[PDB]
């Protein structure tokens, strides 16, 4: 048993490992989305940049959880990072909707993680989740919601013009 470990339940340790995998998975989804918009037959460079940045952010979220695992004296256990559900993301709007769904899924995982930390009376872990993750998710979800709304109102995905102009004005 680790010399630093204190008030850190084995269940929380495992949950943090699961969250690490989910963060890496989200990174992979955004990476895939990014390069979809880099295709010569899609060619929306700011969608590509937007999702690539989101991908790098998710890798940062994973790293911070790996740091936390070690901080508390838990042991990191990695699993395969699953390929994203889709190869062809269809359109700017569809990618945004998939991103919204991903972020809400990640948020639900974090809320379950927080419930466990609360159940195990781990206020350090509760504070960690709240501080670094919960509002970050709420902000990300609000942003994607805003984006989906604008694309829909502008006439996407039918209007190729709409996705083009959104790429320039919102993501540019």
User: Can you say which residues are annotated as belonging to the binding site for Fe cation?
Assistant: 23, 58, 61, 103, 137
CB 7 within 8 Å of CB 101: no
53 makes contact, choosing from a second copy, Mg ion, none, with CB < 5 to 8 Å by partner type, with none
Query: Of 140, 141, 151, 156, which one interacts with Mg ion (CB under 5 A)?
Result: 140
Report the run of H or E that residue 66 belongs to, with start and end: helix 45-72
CB of 81 to a second copy, least distance (A): 4
Name the binder of 7 from Mg ion, a second copy, none, CB < 5-8 A by kind: a second copy
Residue 60 binds which entry of a second copy, Mg ion, none, CB below 5-8 Å type-dependent: none
- Three-state DSSP state, 12: helix
d(CA 39, CA 139): 29
Question: Is position 61 an interface residue for Mg ion (rule: CB under 5 A)?
Answer: yes
For the record, the structure tokens of 60 come out as: 């940062």
For a second copy, the closer CB: 4 or 11: 4
Which residues make Cβ contacts (< 8 Å) with residue 68, sequence separation at least 6?
16, 125, 128
């Amino acid at each position: 048993t680790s010399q630093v470990r204190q008030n850190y339940h084995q269940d929380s340790e495992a949950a943090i490992n699961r969250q690490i995998n989910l963060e890496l998975y989200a990174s992979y989804v955004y990476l895939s989305m990014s390069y979809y918009f880099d295709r010569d037959d899609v060619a929306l460079k700011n969608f590509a940049k937007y999702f690539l940045h989101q991908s790098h952010e998710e890798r940062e979220h994973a790293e911070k959880l790996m740091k936390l695992q070690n901080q508390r004296g838990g042991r990191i256990f990695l699993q395969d990072i699953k390929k994203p559900d889709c190869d062809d993301w269809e359109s700017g709007l569809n990618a945004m909707e998939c991103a919204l769904h991903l972020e809400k899924n990640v948020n639900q995982s974090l809320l379950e993680l927080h419930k466990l930390a609360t159940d195990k009376n781990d206020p350090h872990l509760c504070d960690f989740i709240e501080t670094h993750y919960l509002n970050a998710q709420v902000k990300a979800i609000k942003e994607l919601g805003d984006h989906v709304t604008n694309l829909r109102k502008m006439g996407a995905p039918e209007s190729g013009l709409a996705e083009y102009l959104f790429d320039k004005h919102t993501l540019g």
